[PDB]
Ligand binder design. Structure first.
Ligand SMILES: CCCCCCCCCCCCCCCCCC(=O)OC[C@H](COP(=O)([O-])OCC(O)COP(=O)([O-])OC[C@@H](COC(=O)CCCCCCCCCCCCCCCCC)OC(=O)CCCCCCCCCCCCCCCCC)OC(=O)CCCCCCCCCCCCCCCCC
Ligand SMILES: COC1=C(OC)C(=O)C(C/C=C(\C)CC/C=C(/C)CC/C=C(/C)CC/C=C(/C)CC/C=C(/C)CC/C=C(/C)CC/C=C(/C)CC/C=C(/C)CC/C=C(\C)CCC=C(C)C)=C(C)C1=O
Ligand SMILES: CCCCCCCCCCCCCCCCCC(=O)OC[C@H](COP(=O)([O-])OCC[N+](C)(C)C)OC(=O)CCCCCCCCCCCCCCCCC
Ligand SMILES: CCCCCCCCCCCCCCCCCC(=O)OC[C@H](COP(=O)([O-])OCC[N+](C)(C)C)OC(=O)CCCCCCCCCCCCCCCCC
Ligand SMILES: CCCCCCCCCCCCCCCCCC(=O)OC[C@H](COP(=O)([O-])OCC[N+](C)(C)C)OC(=O)CCCCCCCCCCCCCCCCC
Ligand SMILES: CCCCCCCCCCCCCCCCCC(=O)OC[C@H](COP(=O)(O)OCCN)OC(=O)CCCCCCCCCCCCCCCCC
Ligand SMILES: CCCCCCCCCCCCCCCCCC(=O)OC[C@H](COP(=O)(O)OCCN)OC(=O)CCCCCCCCCCCCCCCCC
Ligand SMILES: CCCCCCCCCCCCCCCCCC(=O)OC[C@H](COP(=O)(O)OCCN)OC(=O)CCCCCCCCCCCCCCCCC
Ligand SMILES: CCCCCCCCCCCCCCCCCC(=O)OC[C@H](COP(=O)(O)OCCN)OC(=O)CCCCCCCCCCCCCCCCC
Ligand SMILES: CCCCCCCCCCCC(=O)OC[C@H](COP(=O)(O)OCC[N+](C)(C)C)OC(=O)CCCCCCCCCCC
Ligand SMILES: CCCCCCCCCCCC(=O)OC[C@H](COP(=O)(O)OCC[N+](C)(C)C)OC(=O)CCCCCCCCCCC
Ligand code: SF4
Lengths: 51, 70, 98, 96, 99, 83, 115, 175, 318, 114, 155
């Protein structure tokens, strides 16, 4: 029984599997140096970290 | 030399000795020269609250011997 | 029914009302489930300890054991929700329509 | 060594418990009089406080049975000072 | 129980903790042991329909022991009356009730 | 007996912590069922008098119940004083 | 009374030390001084961003094992019972099942952190 | 007065509940549940159960430590909400304290209050038992009976914890 | 006289912590072929006094991005809880005599973790956050092992009372019957105190300063004071647990001298270890205690439940 | 319903045993050997009657026999007993272990003189 | 007298600050190698109370040991700014003093004193470990002669 509310409803996938969402992995960027004991003084190591 | 490290250990040792000594001596002073009564279970607490009443001065560490029965 | 039972029973009601009114985070609602278990533990422990119901003294412990299972189970589902949408928002959990 | 000393510790415990078992008849007899004395003192004082209340019956029981019911803390220390009520209620739990 | 496997098999799975007047470690009694025992023995084998009316006296005493509603009301009246008399200087507390 | 010895040596060379764990746990399960002293642990616990020994009303027909604590009747703890 | 007074003294001393720290010294506050520290260069993003937990499975398992200490800690009192045969059986059964849980997760690569 | 310590702890117990029930950032909600766990331990500990009070505090201290790690991984945003940053959070926080105030105000004034049940305001100390136990802790003897009396409880809880580990691995496998 | 007893506990503790910093710098110095503090005072005896004054007259800063109430609550909680773990310790008489003292210390040690988590989170800094989440991993690593190691020992003592451990070791130290448990316990106190080789919450060479990277002046000193008061306490706990001292009720001072020496030596071993070993990776610390200590602790827990039963050596309940 | 019946203060009047807990514990073993019959009589009354009001008379004979017990110690073993319970009184736990030498002196006096 | 008291308080805080100097763990170039040898056993800067700490928020002294380039200059100012006061800067070596061997380079800052204030200049290329230690003990004497409280007392 179509209504205004259910006009944009569409039948679910034939196998219950929805498409995976667009990659939104947010890696953490960290300045490892230069003022860092293990950076040997003048190294600015920009690291993408996951955990 | 290494024995120049000892003065810093002696001061540290004296500081660790005081807490134990102070508690031991303060308990004696607060319980008439005896160990503070240990009451881990109600029976021991029941006897300590009976000591207060028997003492007649509201102190559980004041003992009453055979001189108080006649 | 002393004045302590009022606050304990009010704590359960607050955590129940807190669980039934979601804001956004699934984690915020999981805390309300663990809050409700805490109220039930305290209320049961008080009644058992006051009535000297000796054997019932283990019931509050058995109540915490199964509160952890639910809490761990709720966290495991929260991991999979986060892995699918990048957040623990409950508004994303709407693919299934009543 | 550990199991030989623990075995000796169990015998020292039985001796300690038998010392209590020797005193319990004396302690129980004293406690019974102490509880009955306190209840009577509350009854002799409920009479004066509640002399004017219309329907009050001094010493009325809340139970249908005539069996002896162990008084709870409120009944026994109903009218006594807060100092002794504090020690009779939380004295043990707070003694550390 | 919906299925009474315990009763037939003769195995006691959870009956040992159902009541507070049952056997306890070191024979430690519950505060309302006598009241529960009386209500249980009065209402044994007669069904809850009859016990709800024929064992009403024992069950009301049992509830009084459990929650102490009537005792606390009685204490409240005595305490409230004493304050009224004292507030209007009409009653002197005795020594053993003060120290 | 040759192939089994190979398994034990292999684990003893690669997981010595686990070999000690299972060996320790195996002794915990086996020795109590064999020790002759396990029965005394039960008796010592039963011999510890937490509660008061409520006396029995004497109807005149209880020959095995003592009238005084120091009477020969009743359980004896002579075994415990030597254990 | 003693325990509560001991706690009040410890956290009162802790508080008074903090108060002195903020009111005794000479302060010169300006924007660059209180900016977040990232080794000299401005942080690239917010510290409040998600931080992936690679040991999430082991952290959930900690919740279940942390409840075994609640069940195991009564053992010293449990050993005082007259039912030693039953008590020792259920003590070992409970510990063994705790060990089988560890074995299952270990063998199924559950204790290995995610890549 | 110290005679109302249990009641005073139960007021903080509710205030902590309003802390996380208003649902701010789970970081601050976790703090609220720790305060309630701490005072809840105090309340139980004053009725004669020291093991139960210390145990629930111990379990919830580890419980919220895992929750803290999960909050920085999966329940965090750029501006974590405090009890003042949001009208919905602030509205529910002020409402909870006001109801606590009125219930506390009426119980301490009338010595009674009727909400579903009838509560008595004389003080929690009036219901304590006047007899002493023996040479043991009744709470400790009851908890130690789990292994001699609670054979069936040990099996079901033991099996539940075992299956709990199997289940969480299955749920989080992802394939 | 009870307030005087409290002050006669915390004040000497704060003095011992102050001079443990001197003792560590000189012991590390001589194990590194140098001297350490010897200029400020005779043999460096005034170095702790100079450091305390310097830190408390220095400017403390609240970072612009910090959560102030939690940022300032954390140092207060750390020092308040490090002083609270001394009140049940029998030396030989506890200030607060608890029937469940072992449980109380466990509960307080789990609550003191949040002085790290809230410190690191409230700072709103990436290195403070990485440091805070290393404390979550560390606690997940040792908590289960630590509690069951205590339980195994308490099955030979028979109670959770700390003063009972004195009676248990009246004939012999518990190091002999429980040397395997003493080894794991010692390592677990290193992990629990965030000490090298398990100093990961700070991890100087990796996280600059870890959870307290943003702390300055007095607030930093409170974290440092809490850190050093814990290692002394965790070694007093070890001496009571495994190196029991004889208690003569007429000479309670002899216990204190002998008990103090063992605590100093165990504390010196912490400094000895910090000079000798590298640092674990914090995922390697988790595998150390879950794959090696936990399998052994579970086995030893079963062994110590059965050994008293099969030898008729169950300790008394009271 | 009904009035709770209580004894008068004259029915509860009796000569108390005013000795501290250390005195009682020092003499407990001998006390339980000599005063068994009045003790066990009173203790049977409490468990059978279940009412402290029904065992007041038995509860007085417990007091009467305990006094006579200490009077006999006060006549023959006054000095050894005082040393014994002074040493038990010193310990916080009132341990028997630490007073064996003083216990022996108290045990031998009663054995010979009583 | 009030002047006497503030003089003694000044001697106390001045003593505490010069006896507990905590340099930031901050080195740029070859001059940091000579700074390592001042921490090595022969000179043992730790015995004077001088302890390195990595966090700028726990440091009292910045030793600019090496060359300062235009790329690094913003980083240096940031870490200097994040030092709680009182804070002192020691410039070590020709590069950090006035550019040294690289004075005329497109990418070198001609002296760290263009970026931060400097309290002591230690000459050399590199200064020997014993020459840096002279500058540290010269900084301590400079702190010993501060008159913070006396100047406050007569404002
Ligand atoms: C256990 C005890 C827990 C203590 C409560 C939790 C900590 C407070 C908190 O989390 O608030 C966060 C939250 C965030 O506020 P914020 O810290 O200002 O945000 C930081 C911004 O950067 C804002 O930055 P800023 O620039 O505005 O900061 C400047 C400020 C910064 O100065 C401060 O931060 C104040 C110092 C706080 C000290 C905290 C330590 C408490 C004492 C030690 C106790 C240790 C345990 C014993 O300096 C000032 O100017 C001070 C005057 C302005 C008032 C500052 C706000 C005070 C809030 C109340 C704090 C308590 O505060 C609130 O929203 C207040 C709501 C009420 C919170 C309490 C109720 C929580 C429910 C659970 C507790 C249940 C009741 C138990 C307590 C009652 C016992 C009788
Ligand atoms: C070769 O290539 C290159 C590198 O590659 C290596 C580089 O790297 C770099 C970059 C260089 C740098 C960043 C500088 C390098 C310089 C060095 C000196 C590093 C070399 C190696 C070292 C080992 C130096 C020092 C490091 C360590 C680990 C030594 C260990 C000894 C110590 C004393 C450190 C700290 C130890 C302890 C025990 C604690 C002392 C700490 C304190 C803060 C003092 C006490 C604390 C308190 C809080 C006060 C106490 C009292 C209180 C709080 C009050 C209590 C009392 C009351 C009453 C309240 C360059 C340019 C380079 O070219
Ligand atoms: C002696 C009685 C007495 O002193 O008063 C206690 C009094 C009286 O002693 P009391 O009542 O606790 O014990 C009874 C004493 N006898 C046995 C003699 C009866 O106790 C109190 O009323 C509470 C005291 C409140 C706090 C007292 C001040 C504490 C702060 C002192 C500052 C100096 C501390 C120095 C610490 C040094 C550290 C290195
Ligand atoms: C942060 C500031 C608060 C510090 C943390 C305090 C945690 C609760 C302390 C529990 C004390 C305990 O376990 O009892 C020990 C022991 C229990 O061990 P016990 O078995 O030896 O019991 C002693 C009693 N006898 C002698 C009979 C055995 O209890 C006591 O020492 C005395 C009990 C006094 C109870 C007073 C509790 C009120 C304080 C509760 C505060 C709750 C808020 C905590 C919030 C934490 C989160 C920030
Ligand atoms: C390798 C790194 C880890 C090292 C960890 C272990 C380091 C600390 C080891 C302490 C060993 C004992 C120190 C001996 C000096 C203390 C002297 C002393 O306590 O009194 C004499 C003690 C005897 O005093 P006691 O009080 O310990 O009595 C002995 C034990 N009971 C109670 C069972 C009788 O004897 C020794 O310690 C001689 C060694
Ligand atoms: C040189 C190498 C150094 C190596 C480092 C050593 C570490 C430090 C050693 C531990 C610290 C010990 C410091 C204190 C030792 C002396 C204390 C003492 O014995 O005093 C006598 C004692 C009671 O004295 P006390 O209570 O402390 O003071 C009076 C308080 N009203 O009463 C007694 O007589 C007790 C018997 C004491 C026997 C000694
Ligand atoms: C009566 C009650 C007491 C009995 C309780 C019953 C439960 C007992 C088990 C409880 C402990 C749970 C763990 C048991 C399983 C052992 C762990 C396991 O699953 O190992 C599987 C192992 C996987 O490793 P894999 O990747 O394949 O690489 C090595 C290959 N060789 O693959 C393998 O290769 C393993 C090979 C077989 C290992 C056998 C282990 C037997 C353990 C029990 C021995 C106990 C007796 C020993 C002590 C004797 C007494 C001193
Ligand atoms: C008695 C129980 C009710 C007490 C009143 C509780 C309401 C307190 C005020 C409140 O919660 O906020 C009003 C709410 C809108 O709040 P808000 O989150 O700002 O919505 C727009 C956000 N973009 O609007 C509402 O929904 C209030 C509904 C009432
Ligand atoms: C102001 C709140 C209020 O008064 O509402 C009372 C309402 C009617 O219930 P009732 O009090 O029994 O009827 C009148 C009797 N005088 O009853 C209510 O609406 C109160 C709402 C209670 C919500 C309960 C939710 C389930 C949890 C039940 C546990 C028991 C909670 C009640 C005790 C806590 C009281 C603070
Ligand atoms: C966010 C806060 C939520 C609301 C909390 C309640 C605040 C208003 C209280 C007014 C009630 C009143 O007038 O009573 C005041 C009482 C005082 O204590 P009492 O033991 O009853 O002493 C009074 C009885 N005497 C005379 C017999 C001793 O206060 C409370 O016990 C409130 C709980 C403690 C506060 C929380 C910490
Ligand atoms: C908790 C509540 C805190 C209250 C405030 C406390 C800090 C401020 C107190 C200053 C009082 C005052 O007036 O001292 C100042 C007076 C002289 O005053 P003046 O020259 O007229 O100052 C007018 C303003 N000038 C100075 C800018 C022109 O110098 C003195 O004689 C002593 C000053 C040093 C402090 C002495 C205390 C020593 C303690 C030692 C601890 C180890
Ligand atoms: S001053 Fe000399 S030693 Fe120092 S960085 Fe420059 S070139 Fe290298």
């Amino acid at each position: 029984y179509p209504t205004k509310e259910t006009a944009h409803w569409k039948p679910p996938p034939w196998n219950d599997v929805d498409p995976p969402k667009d990659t939104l992995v947010s890696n953490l960027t960290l300045n490892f140096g230069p003022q860092h004991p293990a950076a040997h003084g003048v190294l600015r190591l920009v690291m993408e970290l996951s955990g | 030399m290494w024995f120049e490290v000892l003065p810093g250990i002696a001061v540290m040792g004296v500081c660790l000795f005081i807490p134990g000594m102070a508690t031991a001596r303060i308990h004696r002073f607060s319980n008439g020269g005896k160990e503070k009564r240990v009451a881990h279970y109600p029976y021991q607490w029941y006897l300590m609250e009976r000591d207060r009443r028997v003492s007649g001065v509201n102190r559980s560490y004041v003992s009453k011997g055979l001189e108080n029965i006649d | 029914m002393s004045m302590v039972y009022m606050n304990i029973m009010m704590a359960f009601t607050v955590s129940l009302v807190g669980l039934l009114m979601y804001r956004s985070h699934l984690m915020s609602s999981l805390l309300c489930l663990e809050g409700m278990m805490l109220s039930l533990f305290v209320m049961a422990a008080l009644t058992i300890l006051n009535s000297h119901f000796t054997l019932a003294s283990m019931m509050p412990i058995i109540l915490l054991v199964f509160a952890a299972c639910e809490a761990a189970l709720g966290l495991s589902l929260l991991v999979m929700v986060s892995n699918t949408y990048g957040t623990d928002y409950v508004q994303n959990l709407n693919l299934l329509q009543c | 060594s550990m199991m030989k000393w623990n075995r000796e510790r169990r015998r020292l415990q039985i001796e300690d418990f038998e010392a209590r078992i020797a005193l319990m008849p004396l302690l129980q007899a004293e406690k019974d009089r102490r509880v009955l004395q306190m209840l009577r003192e509350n009854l002799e004082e409920e009479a004066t406080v509640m002399k004017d209340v219309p329907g009050w019956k001094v010493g009325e029981s809340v139970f249908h049975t005539t069996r002896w019911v162990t008084p709870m803390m409120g009944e026994l220390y109903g009218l006594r000072a807060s100092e002794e009520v504090l020690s009779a209620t939380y004295g043990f739990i707070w003694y550390t | 129980p919906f299925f009474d496997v315990q009763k037939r098999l003769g195995v006691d799975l959870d009956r040992w903790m159902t009541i507070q007047s049952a056997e306890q470690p070191h024979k430690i009694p519950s505060r309302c042991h006598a009241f529960e025992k009386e209500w249980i023995e009065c209402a044994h084998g007669i069904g809850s329909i009859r016990a709800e009316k024929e064992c009403k006296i024992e069950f009301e005493d049992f509830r009084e022991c459990l929650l102490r509603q009537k005792t606390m009301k009685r204490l409240h009246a005595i305490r409230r009356q004493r304050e009224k008399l004292i507030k209007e200087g009409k009653y002197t507390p005795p020594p053993h009730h003060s120290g | 007996a040759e192939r089994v010895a190979a398994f034990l040596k292999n684990v003893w060379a690669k997981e010595p912590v686990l070999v000690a764990s299972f060996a320790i746990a195996g002794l915990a399960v086996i020795l109590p069922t064999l020790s002759p002293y396990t029965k005394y642990s039960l008796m010592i616990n039963r011999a510890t008098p937490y509660n008061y020994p409520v006396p029995l009303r004497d109807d005149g027909n209880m020959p095995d119940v003592p009238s005084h604590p120091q009477d020969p009747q009743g359980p004896s703890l002579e075994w415990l004083k030597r254990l | 009374m003693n325990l509560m007074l001991a706690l009040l003294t410890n956290f009162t001393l802790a508080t008074l030390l903090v108060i002195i720290a903020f009111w005794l010294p000479q302060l010169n506050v300006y924007s660059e001084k209180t900016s977040p520290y990232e080794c000299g260069f401005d942080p690239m993003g917010s510290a409040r961003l998600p931080f992936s937990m690679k040991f999430f499975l082991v952290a959930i398992t900690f919740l279940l094992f942390d409840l075994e200490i609640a069940l195991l800690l009564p053992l010293p009192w449990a050993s005082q019972t007259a039912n030693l045969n039953t008590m020792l059986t259920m003590a070992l059964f409970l510990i063994i099942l705790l060990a089988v849980s560890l074995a299952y997760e270990w063998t199924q690569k559950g204790l290995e952190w995610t890549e | 007065m110290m005679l109302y310590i249990v009641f005073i702890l139960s007021v903080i117990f509710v205030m902590g509940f309003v802390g996380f029930s208003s649902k701010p950032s789970p970081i601050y909600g976790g703090l609220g549940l720790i305060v309630s766990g701490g005072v809840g331990c105090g309340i139980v500990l004053n009725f004669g159960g020291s093991f139960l009070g210390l145990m629930v505090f111990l379990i919830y201290l580890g419980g919220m430590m895992v929750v803290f790690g999960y909050t920085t991984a999966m329940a965090t945003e750029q501006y974590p909400e405090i009890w003042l940053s949001n009208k919905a959070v602030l509205g529910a926080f002020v409402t909870g304290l006001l109801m606590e105030f009125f219930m506390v105000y009426y119980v301490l004034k009338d010595k009674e209050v009727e909400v579903v049940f009838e509560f008595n305001g004389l003080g929690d100390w009036v219901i304590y038992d006047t007899g002493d136990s023996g040479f043991f802790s009744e709470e400790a003897m009851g908890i130690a009976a789990l292994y001699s009396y609670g054979t069936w409880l040990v099996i079901v809880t033991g099996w539940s914890l075992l299956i709990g580990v199997v289940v969480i691995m299955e749920i989080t496998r992802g394939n | 006289m009870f307030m005087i007893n409290i002050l006669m506990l915390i004040i000497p503790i704060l003095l011992a912590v102050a001079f443990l910093t001197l003792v560590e710098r000189k012991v590390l110095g001589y194990m590194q072929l140098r001297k350490g503090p010897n200029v400020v005072g005779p043999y460096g005896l005034l170095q702790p006094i100079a450091d305390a004054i310097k830190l408390f007259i220095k400017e403390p800063l609240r970072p612009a991005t910090s959560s102030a109430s939690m940022f300032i609550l954390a140092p207060i909680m750390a020092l308040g809880l490090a002083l609270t773990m001394w009140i049940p310790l029998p030396m030989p008489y506890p200030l607060i005599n608890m029937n469940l003292g072992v449980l109380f210390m466990l509960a307080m040690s789990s609550l003191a973790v949040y002085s790290i988590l809230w410190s690191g989170w409230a700072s709103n800094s990436k290195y403070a956050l990485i440091g805070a989440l290393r404390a979550v991993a560390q606690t997940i690593s040792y908590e289960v092992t630590l509690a069951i190691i205590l339980l195994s020992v308490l099955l030979m003592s028979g109670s959770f009372t700390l003063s009972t451990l004195i009676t248990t070791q009246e004939q012999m130290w518990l190091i002999l019957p429980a040397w395997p448990l003493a080894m794991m316990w010692f390592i677990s106190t290193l992990a629990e105190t965030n000490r090298a080789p398990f100093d990961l919450t700070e991890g100087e060479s990796e996280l600059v300063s870890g959870f307290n990277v943003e702390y300055a002046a007095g607030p930093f000193a409170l974290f440092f004071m809490a850190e050093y008061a814990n290692i002394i306490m965790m070694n007093i706990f070890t001496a009571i647990l495994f190196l029991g001292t004889s208690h003569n009720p007429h000479m309670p001072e002899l216990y204190t001298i002998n008990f103090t020496i063992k605590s100093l030596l165990l504390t010196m071993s912490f400094l000895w270890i910090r000079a000798s070993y590298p640092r674990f990776r914090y995922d390697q610390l988790m595998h150390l205690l879950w794959k090696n200590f936990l399998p052994l602790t579970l086995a030893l827990c079963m062994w110590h439940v059965s050994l008293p039963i099969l030898t008729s050596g169950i300790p008394p309940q009271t | 319903p009904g009035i709770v019946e209580l004894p008068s203060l004259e029915d509860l009047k009796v000569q108390e045993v005013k000795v501290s807990s250390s005195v009682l514990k020092a003499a407990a073993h001998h006390y339980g050997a000599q005063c068994d019959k009045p003790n066990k009589e009173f203790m049977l009354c409490r468990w059978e009657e279940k009412d402290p009001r029904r065992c007041l008379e038995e509860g007085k004979l417990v007091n009467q026999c305990a006094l006579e017990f200490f009077r006999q110690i006060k006549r023959h073993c006054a000095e050894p007993f005082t040393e014994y319970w002074t040493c038990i009184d010193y310990s916080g736990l009132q341990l028997f272990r630490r007073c064996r030498k003083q216990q022996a002196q108290f045990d031998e006096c009663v054995l010979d003189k009583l | 007298r009030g002047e006497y008291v503030v003089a003694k308080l000044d001697d106390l805080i001045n003593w505490a600050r010069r006896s507990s100097l905590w340099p930031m763990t901050f080195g740029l170039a070859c001059c940091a190698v000579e700074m390592m040898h001042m921490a090595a056993p022969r000179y043992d800067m730790d015995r004077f109370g001088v302890v390195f700490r990595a966090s700028p928020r726990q440091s009292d002294v910045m030793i600019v040991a090496g060359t300062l380039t235009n790329k690094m200059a913003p980083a240096l100012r940031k870490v200097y700014d994040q030092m709680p006061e009182p804070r002192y800067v020691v410039s070590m070596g020709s590069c950090a003093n006035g550019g040294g061997y690289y004075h005329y380079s497109y990418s070198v800052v001609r002296g760290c004193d263009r970026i931060v204030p400097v309290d002591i200049y230690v000459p050399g290329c590199p200064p020997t470990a014993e020459a840096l230690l002279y500058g540290i003990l010269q900084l301590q004497k400079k702190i010993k002669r501060e008159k913070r409280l006396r100047i406050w007392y007569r404002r």
